[PDB]
């Protein structure tokens, strides 16, 4: 039982670290893509909500 609990905690920790890295990579990709697509494109969309 001890081995499974230690493995489960390590497995959960690895998933959280991977998910945080995956989210960071997605954010960096989105930021570059938006800059290439033009940051002045969603300004009108923001104005619509206001």
């Amino acid at each position: 039982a001890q081995a499974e609990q230690e493995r489960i905690r390590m497995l959960s920790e690895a998933k959280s670290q991977i998910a945080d890295l995956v989210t960071l990579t997605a954010s960096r990709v989105l930021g570059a893509e938006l800059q290439a697509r033009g940051h002045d494109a969603l300004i009108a969309e923001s104005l619509a909500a206001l």
């Binding site: 001890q2 081995a3 499974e4 230690e6 493995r7 390590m10």
Partner: protein, 55 residues
């Protein structure tokens, strides 16, 4: 004479009972200690091996 015989019989019987208890008690402790020691060592080796495998 009968009183002396009873005293000799009582001393021999008590000594025999004392010797019997000492041998029986020692065997139980020796067997339990040997069995208990193997139980701890077996789990300790498995836990160390399993931790490396899981990691």
């Amino acid at each position: 004479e009968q009183l002396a015989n009873a005293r000799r019989d009582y001393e021999a019987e008590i000594a025999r009972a004392r010797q019997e208890a000492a041998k029986i008690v020692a065997q139980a402790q020796e067997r339990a200690k040997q069995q208990e020691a193997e139980i701890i060592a077996q789990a300790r080796r498995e836990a160390e091996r399993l931790k490396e495998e899981a990691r």
